[PDB]
Design a binder for this molecule. Structure first.
Ligand SMILES: O=C1NC(=O)[C@@H](c2ccccc2)S1
Ligand SMILES: [Zn+2]
Length: 258
């Protein structure tokens, strides 16, 4: 597969190799804040990242992933809409060429400068590969980024990006604390959806925080210096690696808050 974000291989093309692209529970979606309903039954959300073990950061040609040790329950997401225990495997971002675009989800059609995805898999399936074949296999915690003040807990990530400029480059990335990426509030929206990149599998419980985090223009400018290409190839800046909103179809977006 040669999918990506260009005119020729971007989201509009994905359906030809991955027909579920046109499925019934695709992500991202627009979150209409006036249609989403408070659900008083949602249990409280539990983000337990005290024992998180980061390992490595990888430019995969599409984004950069901060990978964790997910061989035990070290950093887990529980509660909210979720039954059972979901293990953090990695986080990454999607971002734009300009501060007015970059997020995958939108809020009343507003696009943020970027969106953070903390990916977790349901430990009842044993491994990530099995979990992505299940409707309840993953939980993604999505956090919007707006441009304003710097986010101090992001700066270790932006500082290593020079070392992973091109596709296939990785760097050791131990002792990174992903708590430093969260906003104050854990108020959220939730809905059933999909992976936002091929293979586009309909395996995700989406949990999208209401409160964006602020990052500085300088921080996001450094995301934009990354490259989709490999070393020694013609430079194609890694920007606008987001999929646009997809049809909601027969789904409800629930709010955790009034
Ligand atoms: O949150 C998401 N963003 C992505 O790129 C999708 C994905 C695809 C493959 C592995 C992990 C995550 S799901
Ligand atoms: Zn993502």
């Amino acid at each position: 597969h040669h999918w990506g974000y260009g005119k020729h291989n971007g989201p509009e093309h994905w359906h030809k190799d991955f027909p579920i692209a046109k499925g019934e529970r695709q992500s991202p979606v627009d979150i209409d804040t006036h249609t989403a309903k408070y659900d008083p039954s949602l249990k409280p959300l539990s983000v337990s990242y005290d024992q998180a073990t980061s390992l490595r950061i990888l430019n995969n040609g599409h984004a950069f992933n901060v990978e964790f040790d997910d061989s035990q329950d070290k950093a887990v997401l529980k509660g909210g809409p979720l039954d059972g225990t979901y293990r953090l495997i990695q986080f990454h971002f999607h971002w734009g060429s300009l501060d007015g675009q970059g997020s995958e989800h939108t809020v009343d059609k507003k696009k943020y400068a970027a969106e953070l995805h903390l990916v977790h898999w349901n430990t009842k399936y044993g491994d990530f590969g099995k979990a992505v074949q299940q409707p309840d296999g993953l939980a993604v915690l999505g956090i919007f980024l707006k441009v304003g003040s710097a986010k101090p807990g992001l700066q270790k990530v932006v500082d290593v990006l020079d070392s992973i400029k091109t596709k296939g480059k990785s760097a050791d990335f131990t002792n990174f604390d992903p708590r430093g990426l969260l906003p104050e509030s854990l108020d959220y929206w939730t809905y059933p959806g999909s992976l936002t990149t091929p293979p586009l599998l309909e395996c995700v419980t989406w949990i999208v925080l209401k409160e964006p985090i602020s990052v500085s223009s300088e921080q996001v400018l450094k995301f934009r210096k990354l490259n989709f290409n490999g070393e020694g190839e013609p430079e194609e800046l890694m920007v606008d690696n987001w999929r646009p909103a997809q049809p909601l179809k027969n789904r409800q977006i629930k709010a955790s808050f009034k």
